[PDB]
Amino acid sequence: SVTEHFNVYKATRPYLAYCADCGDGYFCYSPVAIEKIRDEAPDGMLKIQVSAQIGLDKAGTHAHTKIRYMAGHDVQESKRDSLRVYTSAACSIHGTMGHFIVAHCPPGDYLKVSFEDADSHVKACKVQYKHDPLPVGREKFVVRPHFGVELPCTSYQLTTAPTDEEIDMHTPPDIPDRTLLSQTAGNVKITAGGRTIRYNCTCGRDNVGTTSTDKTINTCKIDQCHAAVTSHDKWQFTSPFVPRADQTARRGKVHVPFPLTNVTCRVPLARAPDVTYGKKEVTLRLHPDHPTLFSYRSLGAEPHPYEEWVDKFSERIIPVTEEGIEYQWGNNPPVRLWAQL
Amino acid sequence: SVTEHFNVYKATRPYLAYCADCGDGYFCYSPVAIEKIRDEAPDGMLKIQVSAQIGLDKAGTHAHTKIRYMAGHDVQESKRDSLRVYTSAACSIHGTMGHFIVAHCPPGDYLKVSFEDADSHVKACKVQYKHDPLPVGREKFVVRPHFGVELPCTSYQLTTAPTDEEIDMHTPPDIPDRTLLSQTAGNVKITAGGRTIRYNCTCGRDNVGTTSTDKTINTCKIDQCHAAVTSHDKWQFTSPFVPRADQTARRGKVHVPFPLTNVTCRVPLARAPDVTYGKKEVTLRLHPDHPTLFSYRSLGAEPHPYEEWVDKFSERIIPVTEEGIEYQWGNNPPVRLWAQL
Amino acid sequence: SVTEHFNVYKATRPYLAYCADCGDGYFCYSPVAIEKIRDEAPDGMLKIQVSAQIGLDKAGTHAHTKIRYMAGHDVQESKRDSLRVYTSAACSIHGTMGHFIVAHCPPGDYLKVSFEDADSHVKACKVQYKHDPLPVGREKFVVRPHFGVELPCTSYQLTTAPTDEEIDMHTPPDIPDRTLLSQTAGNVKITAGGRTIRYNCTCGRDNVGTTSTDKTINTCKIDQCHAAVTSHDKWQFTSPFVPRADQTARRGKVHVPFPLTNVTCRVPLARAPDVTYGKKEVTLRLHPDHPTLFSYRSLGAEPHPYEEWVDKFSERIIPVTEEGIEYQWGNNPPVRLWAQL
Amino acid sequence: GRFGDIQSRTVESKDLYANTALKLSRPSPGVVHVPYTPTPSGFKYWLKE
Amino acid sequence: NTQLSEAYVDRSDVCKHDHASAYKAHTASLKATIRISYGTINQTTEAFV
């Protein structure tokens, strides 16, 4: 249960993950991380598991224009409207909460997420993010403002729920920020800020020191003074290319958003064409719509099961007889195929 | 007629009303509507007419920076660029007249209009009217920047088109909006505010009737003595997704922008392969180009024609008769293949 | 020599021409357009050529905020966001060098070069931007972020060359100008400027005067008045559909920044299915991926070769002889079918 | 990766079978990569079917 | 209460030029420009056929 933002935001000074496609092909610890995606939608209001307190600023609750961009180039509030999505198209994030961001996009295969106001020059960490449409209903459109249904399907929650599960990361800091050392020749000096520089002297058995200030290593300097990124205060859960194998099992457990409810979506119910139920036959001359799903069942009879996606109006073979046929074409009731007399 | 822009725009200034797709999975009372598309200028002159005055400053005239949207919570007279006709694309920015924006824009089924200037931070209302033209000429391109053709077609009107279009309003404004309610117990303490507000109640001539000032209204309190801002000062469009509870069946007529006429256009001139004409044979090595209608017609003979809207470097099999082949493809001229030794 | 490519923009001050589309619908003066292409893409670095000094400032400022475009109505100095990738999307632009601009992007046919750095909204030199996939590997996946390949492809490399190629610039053109000067009653009472404007009067000695300081020439007015506005430091040879009788039939060269070279990349090594080498026949079954060639090869024998660049998870019997086969299905080693045991 | 590759004993119960091809790789050159590769998702594959 | 809705389908005025004709068939014409070369009378002659 995570129904207050306060401590779960007050813990997380986050780090940038190893991203081999941010720009052209450049790869480094990008300050906004793209951990996973989450399918919580009947349609796909997708909730990507992201790198900071996603909106969770240093202000405890989120400032909506204070997007908690969290790198060693610090945990600060960039202009929170600068966060956007590239789904192969400008995505429609309804919200962003926790270490996730939840909203719709053009449902497809080309993942990208963007910080703008100091979240990059343009900060677009991407993937080949396969998140398919998979629409409820035989008609292949998304009926936004009026549709032929209002049918309940398992959508996620757009109010990011506080906690029913637990994003519990482990292995506190071990990552790529190690330039806080500096060179002398026979005695190296120390002065650092911006990381947790754990030192290591080469001519010296005391050089292992976590840095917050100046220091010195006589007898061996940088170039044998190995000072690297150590930290604590979370589990920035599973940063690949970097230490998610930090050898200290010490974790942080926060919530996750989006409890799934059956949202009633505007279904595909369009007007069907002229029923050419012949005097010894059946047919249904139908029109086109968004890419439809018609159904033939061997209704009453041996089950000739048929169906179809739709992109042009066609006359379907209605099994004409007194023994019935089973029709049901795109979000409406069926046709009991009976010839009269 | 309709041949004066100013008062015919600014009489019934625009009313942001209930658009069924404004948000993530629900609509709202959207500030910018998208009413109906006028598309007959064959270069893709999609003139979408919606609930904003297309190109009108809020005080009435052609304000170049001002796009006038209005609500009873007041006129958002905002910037020009905050509307984007996201037609599967960016804004296909052509122009805008009257109550419509006329756009030559790229193809995409899930069109959108977005509003950002003083009517909201943004509002996105989409339409499925997929802007794939299939233009004039045989060829498989839309070629403006080379003069491959000047194809005769529809020039969708961009002049001062005052009176071919008529923006109407009959059964003047009918929709639900009662936001001028105030707090009382039995004599309701309402103030001035909300809209053109009447009461619909079980008592009072302002408790059930016109409130136009501060009031304590009797015989109808909060809880079941309602009120309503009805659309007045114009015959607004038809309001779709609206009611005829505004039962004043009357007349409001105004112009609509720029009906189309004749006009040339840029086109893809005919790309021909190398025809292997031989002593009893005809073949054509058609190279790949844009997917163009090659029309190898019977030249004077029985005209069983080879048609194709083809994008392949294939063989156009020229069986040359004594009648000759009529070989013309892709908006180039024909060829009269008289086949003789 | 290429130390002064700012000198290479000074001695040849470039300029866009009559461009065939600044919008979708006007053949006009496109002063900031996409003049040509240079696509040596082993890896997807297309460099579109533009007649401004894109890759330098107008005075010579090397930066994105010193973004040079050229015209006699001057070098436009933009910030680099007014470089416009509109290639069917905003492609991932590497930058600009000289006259060309290198970048990557998704596929498409409709390329747009926007030029709107502070001097306009944007001048949009559209062109048929046929950029194909041209994918490399066994698969149809394209990403940096897995450990899956070192594909040794070509790259339009990041070098600004001091000599690689020859961008040829010479023959400073002349601008058609009776409108930059002012016409008298029986003369031209006008000044020259915006070009070295040679005069041509219907009768008079204004019929030979080059323009930096005009005059009033009576007795041969407009109506027999003409002027041509030439330029000093004119080394630009590539007016495509510009007039080239700017009579210097000779060009100087220029170095070729953005040259091709050898560079590896990350690869989508396409996964292999469950392969039961059953008692009469092997049988592999593969899931969908990025669209990869499932590829059996007849090992040793008369080789049945057979691949298919598929993406739908299906099966194939390895007809596995004693000799057997080679199933290299999207970028693994060849599946060695020696069937026995 | 078949329909039911995510094996689950009882719906309230914790243990189960599982046949998704959880094949990680020993990692890449400088980036010490999680080389993880499971089978394609049988929840998503069963949604495909 | 009701939604006592009407609906007014009309000829949409983009068929103020956007019409389609269906010619019920009548006679086909013959306007002939025969180049007449009657020896030294070398000219054109055009008329109904």
CSV table of C-alpha atoms in Angstrom, one decimal, chain A:
chain,number,residue,atom,x,y,z
A,1,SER,CA,0.0,0.0,0.0
A,2,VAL,CA,1.5,3.3,-1.2
A,3,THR,CA,-1.4,5.9,-0.7
A,4,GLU,CA,0.9,8.8,0.2
A,5,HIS,CA,3.7,10.1,-2.0
A,6,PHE,CA,5.9,11.4,0.7
A,7,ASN,CA,8.5,8.8,1.8
A,8,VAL,CA,8.5,7.0,-1.5
A,9,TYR,CA,9.5,10.2,-3.1
A,10,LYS,CA,11.8,11.3,-0.3
A,11,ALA,CA,13.9,8.1,-0.7
A,12,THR,CA,14.6,8.2,-4.4
A,13,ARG,CA,17.7,10.0,-5.6
A,14,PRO,CA,17.9,8.2,-8.9
A,15,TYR,CA,20.6,7.4,-11.4
A,16,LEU,CA,20.9,7.2,-15.2
A,17,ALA,CA,20.8,3.8,-16.9
A,18,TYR,CA,23.0,2.5,-19.7
A,19,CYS,CA,21.2,3.5,-22.9
A,20,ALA,CA,22.7,2.4,-26.2
A,21,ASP,CA,20.1,4.3,-28.2
A,22,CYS,CA,19.4,7.8,-26.9
A,23,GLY,CA,20.6,9.8,-29.9
A,24,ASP,CA,22.1,8.6,-33.2
A,25,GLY,CA,23.5,5.4,-31.6
A,26,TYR,CA,25.2,6.9,-28.5
A,27,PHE,CA,25.1,5.0,-25.3
A,28,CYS,CA,25.6,6.1,-21.7
A,29,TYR,CA,23.9,6.6,-18.3
A,30,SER,CA,20.9,8.6,-19.6
A,31,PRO,CA,19.2,10.4,-16.7
A,32,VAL,CA,15.7,9.2,-17.5
A,33,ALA,CA,15.5,5.5,-17.6
A,34,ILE,CA,13.2,3.2,-19.5
A,35,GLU,CA,12.9,0.1,-17.4
A,36,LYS,CA,9.9,-1.7,-18.8
A,37,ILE,CA,6.5,-1.3,-20.3
A,38,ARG,CA,3.2,-2.4,-18.7
A,39,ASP,CA,0.0,-3.6,-20.3
A,40,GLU,CA,-2.8,-2.1,-18.3
A,41,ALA,CA,-5.5,-1.3,-20.9
A,42,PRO,CA,-8.3,-2.9,-22.7
A,43,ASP,CA,-7.0,-0.6,-25.4
A,44,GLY,CA,-3.5,0.1,-24.2
A,45,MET,CA,-3.2,3.0,-21.7
A,46,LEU,CA,0.3,1.7,-21.3
A,47,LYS,CA,2.3,2.2,-18.1
A,48,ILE,CA,6.0,2.2,-18.7
A,49,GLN,CA,8.3,1.5,-15.7
A,50,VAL,CA,10.5,4.6,-15.8
A,51,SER,CA,13.7,5.8,-14.3
A,52,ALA,CA,13.0,8.4,-11.6
A,53,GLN,CA,10.1,9.3,-9.4
A,54,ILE,CA,8.1,10.0,-12.6
A,55,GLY,CA,6.7,13.3,-11.7
A,56,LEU,CA,7.7,12.5,-8.0
A,57,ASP,CA,9.8,15.6,-7.4
A,58,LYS,CA,11.8,16.9,-4.4
A,59,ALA,CA,8.5,18.6,-3.4
A,60,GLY,CA,7.1,15.4,-1.8
A,61,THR,CA,4.0,15.4,-3.9
A,62,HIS,CA,4.7,16.1,-7.6
A,63,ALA,CA,4.9,19.6,-9.0
A,64,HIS,CA,3.2,19.1,-12.4
A,65,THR,CA,5.9,21.3,-14.0
A,66,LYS,CA,8.5,19.8,-11.7
A,67,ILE,CA,9.3,16.5,-13.3
A,68,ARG,CA,11.8,14.8,-11.0
A,69,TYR,CA,14.7,14.4,-13.4
A,70,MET,CA,17.1,12.4,-11.3
A,71,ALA,CA,20.7,12.1,-12.3
A,72,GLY,CA,24.1,12.9,-10.7
A,73,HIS,CA,23.4,15.9,-12.6
A,74,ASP,CA,21.0,16.1,-9.8
A,75,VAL,CA,17.6,15.0,-8.6
A,76,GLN,CA,15.9,18.2,-9.6
A,77,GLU,CA,12.7,19.4,-11.1
A,78,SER,CA,12.9,19.9,-14.8
A,79,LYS,CA,9.9,21.4,-16.7
A,80,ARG,CA,7.4,18.5,-16.2
A,81,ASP,CA,5.6,19.3,-19.5
A,82,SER,CA,8.9,18.4,-21.2
A,83,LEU,CA,8.1,14.7,-20.7
A,84,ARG,CA,6.5,13.2,-23.7
A,85,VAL,CA,6.4,9.9,-25.6
A,86,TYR,CA,7.4,8.7,-29.0
A,87,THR,CA,5.5,5.5,-29.8
A,88,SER,CA,6.6,6.0,-33.4
A,89,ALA,CA,4.2,8.9,-32.7
A,90,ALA,CA,3.5,11.5,-30.0
A,91,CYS,CA,1.9,9.4,-27.3
A,92,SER,CA,-0.9,10.4,-25.0
A,93,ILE,CA,0.3,10.0,-21.4
A,94,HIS,CA,-2.8,10.5,-19.3
A,95,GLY,CA,-0.7,10.5,-16.2
A,96,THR,CA,2.7,9.6,-14.7
A,97,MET,CA,3.2,8.3,-11.2
A,98,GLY,CA,5.8,6.5,-9.2
A,99,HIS,CA,8.5,4.9,-11.3
A,100,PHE,CA,5.9,4.6,-14.1
A,101,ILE,CA,4.0,6.6,-16.7
A,102,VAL,CA,0.6,5.6,-17.8
A,103,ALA,CA,-1.4,6.7,-20.9
A,104,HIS,CA,-2.2,5.8,-24.5
A,105,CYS,CA,0.0,6.1,-27.6
A,106,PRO,CA,-0.1,5.0,-31.2
A,107,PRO,CA,-0.1,1.2,-30.5
A,108,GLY,CA,2.9,-0.3,-32.2
A,109,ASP,CA,6.6,-1.3,-32.1
A,110,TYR,CA,8.9,1.8,-31.7
A,111,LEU,CA,9.4,2.8,-28.0
A,112,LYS,CA,10.7,6.3,-27.0
A,113,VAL,CA,10.3,8.5,-23.9
A,114,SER,CA,11.4,12.1,-23.8
A,115,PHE,CA,12.4,14.7,-21.2
A,116,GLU,CA,12.6,18.2,-22.6
A,117,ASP,CA,13.2,21.1,-20.2
A,118,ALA,CA,16.6,19.9,-19.2
A,119,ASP,CA,15.3,16.4,-19.6
A,120,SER,CA,17.5,16.5,-22.7
A,121,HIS,CA,18.6,18.7,-25.4
A,122,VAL,CA,16.1,16.2,-26.4
A,123,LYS,CA,16.0,13.3,-24.1
A,124,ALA,CA,14.6,10.3,-25.9
A,125,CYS,CA,15.5,6.9,-24.5
A,126,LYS,CA,13.9,4.4,-26.7
A,127,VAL,CA,13.4,0.7,-27.5
A,128,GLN,CA,11.8,-1.5,-30.2
A,129,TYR,CA,8.8,-1.2,-27.9
A,130,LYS,CA,6.3,-3.7,-29.3
A,131,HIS,CA,2.9,-2.8,-27.8
A,132,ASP,CA,0.2,-3.9,-30.3
A,133,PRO,CA,-3.3,-2.5,-30.6
A,134,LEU,CA,-5.2,-5.8,-29.9
A,135,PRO,CA,-8.7,-4.1,-30.0
A,136,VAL,CA,-11.8,-5.3,-28.2
A,137,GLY,CA,-14.4,-6.0,-30.9
A,138,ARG,CA,-14.2,-7.2,-34.5
A,139,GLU,CA,-14.1,-3.7,-36.0
A,140,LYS,CA,-10.5,-2.5,-36.1
A,141,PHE,CA,-11.1,1.2,-35.2
A,142,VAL,CA,-11.0,3.0,-31.9
A,143,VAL,CA,-14.4,4.6,-31.7
A,144,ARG,CA,-13.6,7.8,-29.7
A,145,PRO,CA,-16.6,10.1,-29.5
A,146,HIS,CA,-19.5,7.8,-30.3
A,147,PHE,CA,-19.3,4.1,-31.1
A,148,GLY,CA,-21.7,1.2,-31.5
A,149,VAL,CA,-21.2,0.0,-27.9
A,150,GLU,CA,-20.3,1.2,-24.5
A,151,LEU,CA,-18.8,-2.2,-23.6
A,152,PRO,CA,-16.8,-3.0,-20.5
A,153,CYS,CA,-13.3,-4.4,-21.0
A,154,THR,CA,-10.4,-4.8,-18.6
A,155,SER,CA,-8.7,-1.4,-18.8
A,156,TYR,CA,-6.1,-0.4,-16.3
A,157,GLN,CA,-6.5,2.4,-13.8
A,158,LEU,CA,-5.6,6.0,-14.9
A,159,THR,CA,-5.6,7.1,-11.3
A,160,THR,CA,-2.3,5.6,-10.5
A,161,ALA,CA,-3.1,3.4,-7.5
A,162,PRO,CA,-1.0,3.8,-4.3
A,163,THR,CA,0.1,0.2,-3.8
A,164,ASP,CA,-1.2,-3.3,-4.1
A,165,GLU,CA,2.1,-4.6,-5.3
A,166,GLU,CA,5.7,-3.5,-4.5
A,167,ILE,CA,8.3,-2.3,-6.9
A,168,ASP,CA,11.2,-3.5,-4.6
A,169,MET,CA,14.6,-2.8,-6.1
A,170,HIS,CA,17.9,-3.8,-4.5
A,171,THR,CA,21.7,-3.4,-4.8
A,172,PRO,CA,22.4,0.3,-3.8
A,173,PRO,CA,24.7,2.4,-5.8
A,174,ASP,CA,27.2,0.9,-8.3
A,175,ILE,CA,27.1,2.7,-11.6
A,176,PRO,CA,29.0,4.9,-14.1
A,177,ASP,CA,30.1,8.0,-12.3
A,178,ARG,CA,33.8,7.7,-11.4
A,179,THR,CA,35.5,10.9,-12.6
A,180,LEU,CA,35.6,12.5,-9.2
A,181,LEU,CA,39.2,11.5,-8.8
A,182,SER,CA,42.1,13.6,-10.2
A,183,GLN,CA,45.7,13.2,-11.0
A,184,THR,CA,48.9,14.1,-9.1
A,185,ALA,CA,52.0,12.2,-10.2
A,186,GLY,CA,53.5,10.7,-7.0
A,187,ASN,CA,50.8,12.1,-4.7
A,188,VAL,CA,47.3,12.5,-6.1
A,189,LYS,CA,45.0,14.9,-4.4
A,190,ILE,CA,41.2,14.5,-3.8
A,191,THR,CA,38.3,16.9,-4.2
A,192,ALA,CA,34.9,15.7,-5.4
A,193,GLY,CA,31.1,16.4,-5.4
A,194,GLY,CA,28.3,14.9,-7.5
A,195,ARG,CA,28.8,11.2,-6.7
A,196,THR,CA,29.8,8.8,-4.0
A,197,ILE,CA,33.4,8.4,-5.0
A,198,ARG,CA,34.7,5.3,-3.2
A,199,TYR,CA,38.5,5.7,-3.6
A,200,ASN,CA,41.3,3.2,-4.0
A,201,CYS,CA,45.0,4.0,-3.7
A,202,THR,CA,47.6,2.2,-5.7
A,203,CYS,CA,50.7,2.9,-3.5
A,204,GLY,CA,48.6,2.8,-0.4
A,205,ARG,CA,46.5,0.5,1.8
A,206,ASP,CA,44.1,3.3,3.0
A,207,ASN,CA,43.0,4.7,-0.3
A,208,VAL,CA,39.6,3.1,-0.3
A,209,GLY,CA,37.5,6.1,0.9
A,210,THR,CA,34.0,7.1,0.1
A,211,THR,CA,34.3,10.7,-0.9
A,212,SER,CA,32.4,13.7,0.2
A,213,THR,CA,35.3,16.2,0.4
A,214,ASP,CA,39.0,16.5,-0.3
A,215,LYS,CA,41.6,13.8,0.3
A,216,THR,CA,45.1,12.6,-0.7
A,217,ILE,CA,46.8,9.5,-1.8
A,218,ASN,CA,50.6,9.7,-1.7
A,219,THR,CA,52.7,7.0,-3.4
A,220,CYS,CA,50.0,6.2,-6.1
A,221,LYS,CA,47.5,8.6,-7.7
A,222,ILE,CA,44.7,8.4,-10.1
A,223,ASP,CA,46.0,6.0,-12.6
A,224,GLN,CA,45.9,3.4,-9.8
A,225,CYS,CA,43.6,5.5,-7.7
A,226,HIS,CA,40.3,3.8,-8.6
A,227,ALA,CA,37.4,5.8,-7.3
A,228,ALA,CA,34.0,4.8,-8.5
A,229,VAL,CA,30.2,5.3,-8.0
A,230,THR,CA,29.0,3.9,-4.7
A,231,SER,CA,25.7,4.9,-3.1
A,232,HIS,CA,22.6,3.9,-1.1
A,233,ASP,CA,19.1,5.2,-0.4
A,234,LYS,CA,17.3,3.0,-2.8
A,235,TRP,CA,17.2,0.1,-5.2
A,236,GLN,CA,17.0,1.7,-8.7
A,237,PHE,CA,15.8,-1.7,-9.5
A,238,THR,CA,17.4,-3.4,-12.4
A,239,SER,CA,19.7,-1.2,-14.4
A,240,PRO,CA,21.3,-3.4,-17.0
A,241,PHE,CA,24.8,-2.7,-18.4
A,242,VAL,CA,25.6,-1.5,-14.8
A,243,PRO,CA,25.4,-2.9,-11.3
A,244,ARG,CA,22.1,-4.6,-10.6
A,245,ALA,CA,24.6,-7.0,-9.2
A,246,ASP,CA,25.7,-4.7,-6.4
A,247,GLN,CA,26.7,-7.2,-3.7
A,248,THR,CA,24.7,-5.6,-1.0
A,249,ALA,CA,21.1,-6.9,-0.8
A,250,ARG,CA,19.4,-3.7,0.3
A,251,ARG,CA,16.1,-2.8,-1.3
A,252,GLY,CA,13.4,-0.3,-1.6
A,253,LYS,CA,9.7,-1.3,-1.8
A,254,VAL,CA,7.3,1.3,-3.3
A,255,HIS,CA,3.9,0.8,-4.9
A,256,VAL,CA,2.7,0.5,-8.5
A,257,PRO,CA,-0.2,2.3,-10.2
A,258,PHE,CA,-3.3,1.3,-12.3
A,259,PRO,CA,-5.8,-1.2,-10.8
A,260,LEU,CA,-7.7,-2.7,-13.8
A,261,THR,CA,-11.4,-2.0,-14.2
A,262,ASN,CA,-13.8,-2.8,-17.0
A,263,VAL,CA,-13.9,0.5,-18.9
A,264,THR,CA,-16.9,0.8,-21.2
A,265,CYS,CA,-15.4,1.6,-24.6
A,266,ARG,CA,-17.3,2.9,-27.7
A,267,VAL,CA,-17.7,-0.3,-29.6
A,268,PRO,CA,-17.9,-1.1,-33.3
A,269,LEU,CA,-21.6,-1.4,-34.2
A,270,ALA,CA,-22.3,-0.2,-37.8
A,271,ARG,CA,-25.2,-0.6,-40.2
A,272,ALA,CA,-25.2,-3.8,-42.1
A,273,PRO,CA,-26.1,-4.0,-45.8
A,274,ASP,CA,-29.1,-5.5,-47.7
A,275,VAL,CA,-30.0,-9.0,-46.7
A,276,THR,CA,-30.3,-10.9,-50.0
A,277,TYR,CA,-31.9,-13.9,-48.4
A,278,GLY,CA,-32.8,-15.6,-51.6
A,279,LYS,CA,-35.9,-17.6,-52.1
A,280,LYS,CA,-33.7,-20.7,-52.0
A,281,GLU,CA,-30.5,-19.1,-50.6
A,282,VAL,CA,-29.0,-16.6,-48.3
A,283,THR,CA,-26.6,-13.8,-48.7
A,284,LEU,CA,-25.8,-10.6,-46.8
A,285,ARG,CA,-24.5,-7.6,-48.9
A,286,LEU,CA,-22.6,-5.6,-46.3
A,287,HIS,CA,-20.8,-2.3,-46.6
A,288,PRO,CA,-17.3,-1.4,-45.4
A,289,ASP,CA,-16.2,0.3,-42.2
A,290,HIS,CA,-13.2,0.2,-39.9
A,291,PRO,CA,-11.6,-3.3,-40.3
A,292,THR,CA,-14.5,-5.4,-39.3
A,293,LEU,CA,-15.1,-8.8,-37.8
A,294,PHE,CA,-18.1,-10.7,-39.3
A,295,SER,CA,-19.2,-14.1,-38.2
A,296,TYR,CA,-20.8,-17.2,-39.8
A,297,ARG,CA,-21.8,-20.1,-37.6
A,298,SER,CA,-23.5,-23.2,-38.8
A,299,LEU,CA,-26.5,-22.1,-36.9
A,300,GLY,CA,-28.5,-25.0,-35.7
A,301,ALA,CA,-26.6,-27.3,-37.9
A,302,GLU,CA,-23.2,-28.7,-38.3
A,303,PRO,CA,-21.0,-25.8,-37.3
A,304,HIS,CA,-19.5,-24.2,-40.4
A,305,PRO,CA,-17.5,-21.6,-38.4
A,306,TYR,CA,-16.5,-18.6,-40.4
A,307,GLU,CA,-15.6,-14.9,-39.6
A,308,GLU,CA,-13.6,-12.2,-41.1
A,309,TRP,CA,-11.7,-8.9,-40.9
A,310,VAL,CA,-13.4,-6.3,-43.1
A,311,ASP,CA,-12.2,-3.6,-45.5
A,312,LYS,CA,-14.8,-3.6,-48.3
A,313,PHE,CA,-18.5,-4.5,-48.5
A,314,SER,CA,-19.2,-8.0,-49.6
A,315,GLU,CA,-22.1,-10.4,-50.1
A,316,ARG,CA,-21.6,-13.2,-47.6
A,317,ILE,CA,-23.0,-16.7,-48.2
A,318,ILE,CA,-26.0,-16.9,-45.8
A,319,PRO,CA,-26.8,-20.7,-45.4
A,320,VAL,CA,-30.3,-20.4,-46.6
A,321,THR,CA,-32.6,-23.1,-45.3
A,322,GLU,CA,-35.4,-23.6,-42.7
A,323,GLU,CA,-32.7,-25.2,-40.4
A,324,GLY,CA,-31.2,-21.8,-39.7
A,325,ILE,CA,-27.8,-20.2,-40.0
A,326,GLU,CA,-25.8,-18.4,-37.4
A,327,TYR,CA,-24.7,-14.8,-38.3
A,328,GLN,CA,-23.2,-12.1,-36.1
A,329,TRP,CA,-21.2,-9.4,-37.7
A,330,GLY,CA,-19.5,-6.6,-35.8
A,331,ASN,CA,-20.9,-5.8,-32.4
A,332,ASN,CA,-24.5,-6.6,-32.9
A,333,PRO,CA,-27.0,-9.5,-32.4
A,334,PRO,CA,-26.9,-12.4,-34.8
A,335,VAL,CA,-29.0,-13.6,-37.7
A,336,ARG,CA,-30.9,-16.9,-37.4
A,337,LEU,CA,-30.8,-17.8,-41.1
A,338,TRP,CA,-34.3,-19.1,-41.9
A,339,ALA,CA,-36.1,-19.0,-45.3
A,340,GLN,CA,-39.8,-18.5,-45.0
A,341,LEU,CA,-43.0,-19.5,-47.0
